């Protein structure tokens, strides 16, 4: 109901190992591949895996073109 689009997109970005770029409400632009996700959290990779919270994210732009069926 509430994840009909948010979950498949993140799953496709994770499986294909796409180097996405996340934008926080603070304006910072975090970089790194997505390792996992949930209803309120996303685990980045890059040099050191760090946690990010959904309520703090604004836009998740994929560096390379992503294809989600």
């Amino acid at each position: 109901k509430g994840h009909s689009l948010q979950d498949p997109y993140l799953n496709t970005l994770r499986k294909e190992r796409v180097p996405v770029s996340i934008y926080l409400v603070n304006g910072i632009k975090l970089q790194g591949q997505i390792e996992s996700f949930d209803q309120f959290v996303i685990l980045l990779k890059n040099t050191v895996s760090q946690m990010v919270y959904k309520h703090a994210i604004s836009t998740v732009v994929p560096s390379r073109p992503v294809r989600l069926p």
Binding site: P19, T47, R64
Partner: protein, 262 residues
């Protein structure tokens, strides 16, 4: 004493340069971060142990087509964060950019297209430069400092090449190319490294494939160590050791005073 050495050598095929001794030559020489350009292979090819250098972490952002280009970094300590892609189409598609942020500085690795292959390559180079000038105008406002290991494939001034008159028609020396390269070092403020500590001529990095050109030393300076003015004071020395010669481009070595610390 406190010093930070950085190597920038366009190998144009890590396989060939390694078969000639690039890997061993670098491992034997002291260095902190090797920012080589033009991998000509995929990130997996770099991940192989034959490419890795003991004691240096390895990262790479391959291109859409292996032979079309590619960039790879060799860090001695786990950087703060690695960023692949520059935002442009030609940048993200052909993997011509890869940055590794540190506590303050953030060495990058830029690889402009050659342009000598054809008019289409020249147009791609012009477009990428018209985008990169805007990228730099936007980047010069942030606080942290950068050290681009860019292979601009464009000479800056006449002193950077011998017999500049005949090169007026060959790519890499056209009027708009010189204009862009001088504007990047002009109003934007991004100073240079090689021509900042030793302003003497007869120093070049690139040489044509013809061995006769090397004997006569009719080369161009394509490998640049662009660095924000904040670091211009820390530049200590630079060198263009052309003796080994691992590819069509000569290795550009530099040493600054800023001490990286993860």
């Amino acid at each position: 004493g406190p010093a930070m050495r950085i190597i920038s050598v366009n190998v144009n095929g890590i396989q060939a340069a390694a078969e000639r001794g690039l890997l061993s030559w670098l491992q034997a020489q002291n260095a902190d971060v090797i920012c080589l350009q033009d991998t000509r292979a995929s990130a997996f090819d770099l991940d192989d142990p034959s490419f890795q250098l003991d004691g240096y972490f390895l990262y790479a952002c391959d291109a859409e087509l292996p032979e079309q280009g590619g960039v790879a970094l060799y860090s001695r300590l786990q950087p703060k964060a690695v960023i692949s892609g520059l935002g442009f189409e030609t940048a993200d598609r052909y993997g011509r950019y890869l940055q590794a942020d540190f506590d303050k500085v953030s060495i990058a690795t830029l690889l402009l297209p050659s342009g000598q292959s054809g008019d289409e390559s020249l147009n791609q180079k012009f477009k990428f430069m018209d985008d990169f000038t805007h990228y730099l105008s936007k980047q010069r406002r942030k606080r942290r400092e950068y050290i681009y290991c860019g292979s601009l494939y464009v000479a800056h001034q006449k002193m950077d090449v011998k017999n500049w008159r005949e090169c007026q028609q060959m790519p890499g020396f056209l009027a708009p190319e010189r204009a862009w390269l001088d504007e990047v070092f002009g109003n934007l403020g991004y100073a240079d490294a090689l021509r900042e500590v030793s302003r003497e001529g007869d120093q070049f990095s690139w040489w044509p494939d013809s061995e006769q050109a090397e004997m006569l030393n009719l080369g161009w300076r394509f490998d640049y160590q662009v660095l924000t003015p904040g670091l211009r004071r820390f530049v200590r020395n630079a060198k263009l050791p052309r003796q080994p010669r691992f590819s069509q481009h000569a290795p550009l070595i530099v040493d600054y005073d800023w001490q990286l610390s993860i």
